[PDB]
RNA sequence: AUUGAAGCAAGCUGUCCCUGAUGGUCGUCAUCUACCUGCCUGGAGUCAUCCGCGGCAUUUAGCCGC
């Protein structure tokens, strides 16, 4: 039994989860540099709040799927390709899943020499001397960064076609709260007010102000475009792998990534699918039993590179 | 039902679709280096802005009819004429359908050898002086590529009358949002700010500002000039074919490709027509069944050039 | 403004990738209190039978219960 037939019958998959604070009724939204909380008027006039941006939700899905301690995937995903950056002493400096872009890092394919630079040059030569073959780029990613296929890349540098090639994200997710109402609560640093004077030297007492919010409903949205994976069309077992990976990554994030900030503890009540309608979501304990087989299948199909893990040493 | 027998006197067919983001509330527009701020005064006294320009709408309406990977029409469209340019290795790289410039290009009709140049010259030596008739020009364009009829083309070369011959657009479109209220957001380069504060290398932190926009209603307008089509009068069945192609293009753009930019998916809630009202637009599942009969009929009339696939030399 | 196309500046280039969060005790004392007249004179009144004409009758063809 496979879900890919039922999903490849449909042009898009949409999921929605409803969340509430675990304790109390307040939460802290992301603080944008010059705006702090980010909110505005909805279509019906009601006040809306952007709880967390998608660009960080991506980092959270990556952080749940990968372990920076063992420098390896979790037991199920163990086998997928990943580039690692070493330092001059041979200690792991970073890895793609830890990185932001995962490919265009100034630590990967940078410095005095990197094999990945010539690998990408030779692979993408078809795009440097002809039309932009999306499928060949996609499998190009498959070879090195299976996660960069889900979250995309932008290779802006001159040597790589001047950045004229790109792969937009196939998965987008964000979390939002509607009809919000603010709650202000400041404070003071308070000890030894008279002994300690100049506040600029850390002395004295100084006040601060903080704003929390409350909402009747909080929703997390997941938007996976089944049109893009079939536009890559690289392999139906590869599509099986990509969908199972996305489902696993979300189903597990919704349990282990629950509290986004120290003052933003949330709990999931239910998960629902918006498209396909009437479709069933598999259990996480079953995704974890199946996914190793899909990875073994795609390795037997030889779509991954050899060796799967590629190590490059960085120096400025 | 037969379209032109019902329309039969209206000079223009004006249609409207009302559409919204699939999830959430926000969308983003294009960015102009030359025009700058894309918000302007409105006669209704409220903010309006173009969500998409006609120039881009045309570039997208031709995409929904073609497969970039198989390099072929969709199974209803398979049979229409398409112009391909070979590469020096013998695998064509581009076609007139997927490029807006079509005839007047640096890859067709310009080069060091030019055959389609002579194939146009042969009938330019028939048109010669005086007001060139739109009939024969349209027949020539339907011999090379009907897309250059439905979306227009002209030739700038001095040897080709220096732009004196020019076929105007038949289909027009744009998208607009009304009562737009602005919003704002941002982000930063998170990881590894410590090793160097410099921005030129991209290691250090940088604050990036962006602005999303919200509106109670967003709408697409399209207008088809039926008086010009019937002024072509190439046989009633050919007119029925051209009308069916324009409607299939719209019905495709409104079911797939609505996400002009990957940050925001849209779907349409309704489609409507304003000027010739009462009549209802056909459904997709019947237009898909009807079209192939029309294609076979017009092929049996043999109005377009008989070598349905044309290859031409390309050199640089 | 019209017979012999202003319905006529018409084809003209801006795209995707980015995590802003770790922790700050607004807290202690304070008396609101005392005196004062609401009240006062004033007509709502007056006469008008619960019987039943229902049912039987489309009914003046004709009567009959509680």
| Whole-number distance in Å between B9 CA and C27 C1' | 85
SS3 of residue B143 by DSSP: helix
Give the count of beta carbons closer than 10 Å to the beta carbon of residue B263: 16
CA–CA distance, B29 with B214 (Å, rounded to integer): 11
Pick from A292, A255, A294: nearest CA to A271: A255
**Cβ of B257 near strand C (distance < 7 A):** no
Report CA dihedral (B80, B85, B86, B91) to the nearest 10 degrees: -50
> Chains A, B: CB contacts under 8 A, how many?
68
| Whole-number distance in Å between B178 CA and C14 C1' | 24
Pick from A253, A180, A254, A182: nearest CA to A217: A180
Whether the CB-CB separation of B28 and B158 falls below 8 Å is answered with no
Residue nearest C12, CA–C1′ metric = B55
Alpha helices in chain B (DSSP H): 3-7, 54-61, 115-127, 134-144, 147-150, 226-232, 236-253, 284-301
Residues 6+ apart with CB under 8 A from A294: A237, A240, A241, A244
CA–CA distance, B25 with A143 (Å, rounded to integer): 37
- Contact state of B184 with A42 under an 8 Å Cβ cutoff: no
* Main-chain phi, psi angles of B184, to 5 degrees: -145, 155
Which one of A16, A30, A32 would you mutate to disrupt binding with B, by most B Cβ within 10 Å of its Cβ? A32
- Bond before A136 cis per omega within 30 degrees: no
Residue A124 tokens read as 């993408």
- A50 and B CB contact within 8 Å: yes
| Whole-number distance in Å between B303 CA and C36 C1' | 114
**Cβ of A259 near strand C (distance < 7 A):** no
Identify the closest residue of chain B to A54 by CA–CA distance.
B263
B82-85/B309-312 β-pairing: parallel
CA–CA distance, B254 with B221 (Å, rounded to integer): 12
CA–CA distance, B237 with B286 (Å, rounded to integer): 18
Residues 6+ apart with CB under 8 A from A265: A21, A22, A23, A27, A258, A259
- Contact state of A172 with B262 under an 8 Å Cβ cutoff: yes
Q: What is the DSSP letter of B67?
A: E
Cross-strand pairs, B52 = B175
Handedness of CA B36, B219, B260, B179 (dihedral sign): positive
- DSSP secondary structure, chain A, as one string: --SHHHHHTSS-EEEEEEEEESSSS-B----BTTTBSEEEE-TTS-EEEEEE-HHHHHHHHHHHHEETTTTEE-TTTTT--EEEEE-TTSSEEEETTTSSSSSS-TTSS-SS--HHHHHHHHHHHHHHTS---HHHHHHHHHHH-HHHHHH-EE--STTTGGG--EE--SEEEEEEEES-EEEE--EEE-S-TTT---GGGT-S-EEE--EEEE-SEEEEEEEE-HHHHHHH---HHHHHHHHHHHHHHHHHHHHHS---STT--EEEEEEEEEESTTPPPPPHHHHHHHHHHHHHHHHHTT-S-SSSEEEEE---
- Contact state of A35 with B203 under an 8 Å Cβ cutoff: no
- Nucleotides of chain C in contact with protein CB (under 7 A) are 5, 7, 10-26
* Crossing angle of helices B115-127 and B134-144, rounded to 10°: 160
**Cβ of B38 near strand C (distance < 7 A):** no
What CA–CA distances, in Å, run from A224 to A7, A206, A250, B159, B160? 11, 47, 11, 52, 50
The method recorded for this entry reads: cryo-EM
In units of Å, what resolution does this entry have? 3.2
Q: Which of B87, B191, B215 sits opposite A100 (nearest CB)?
A: B191
Identify the closest residue of chain A to B206 by CA–CA distance.
A33
CA–CA distance, B117 with A78 (Å, rounded to integer): 59
SS3 of residue B17 by DSSP: strand
């Amino acid at each position: 039994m496979k879900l890919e037939p039922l999903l490849s019958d449909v042009p898009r998959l949409l999921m929605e989860a409803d969340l509430v604070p675990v304790q109390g009724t307040r939460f802290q939204p992301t603080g944008f540099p010059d705006l702090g909380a980010a909110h505005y008027e909805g279509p019906d006039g009601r006040p809306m709040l952007l709880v967390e941006s998608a660009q960080s939700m991506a980092n959270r899905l990556e952080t749940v799927c990968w372990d920076k301690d063992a420098d390896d995937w979790v037991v199920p995903l163990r086998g997928l390709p990943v580039v690692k950056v070493l330092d001059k002493a041979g200690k792991p400096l970073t890895n793609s899943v830890l990185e932001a872009h995962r490919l265009n890092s100034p630590y990967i394919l940078e410095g005095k020499d990197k094999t990945l630079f010539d690998l990408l040059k030779q692979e993408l030569a078809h795009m440097e001397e002809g039309p932009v073959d999306i499928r060949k780029l996609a499998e190009t990613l498959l070879k090195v960064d299976a996660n960069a296929v889900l979250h995309g890349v932008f290779l802006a540098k001159k040597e790589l076609a001047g950045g004229r090639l790109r792969l937009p994200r196939a998965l987008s997710a964000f979390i939002e709260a509607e009809d919000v109402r603010v709650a202000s609560s400041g404070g003071v640093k308070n000890d030894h007010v008279n002994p300690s004077g100049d506040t600029s030297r850390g002395f004295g007492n100084v006040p601060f102000a903080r704003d929390e919010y409350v909402s009747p409903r909080i929703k997390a949205y997941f938007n996976l475009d089944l049109a893009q994976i079939r536009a890559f069309g690289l392999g139906e077992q590869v599509d099986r792998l990509l969908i199972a990976l996305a489902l696993y990554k979300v189903r597990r994030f919704l349990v282990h990534g629950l509290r986004l900030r120290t003052a933003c503890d949330l709990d999931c009540q239910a998960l629902r699918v918006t498209r396909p309608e009437g479709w069933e979501v598999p259990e996480l304990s079953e995704l974890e039993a199946a996914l190793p087989g899909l990875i073994e299948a795609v390795a037997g199909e030889g779509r991954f590179a050899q060796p799967a893990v590629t190590i490059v040493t960085y120096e400025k």
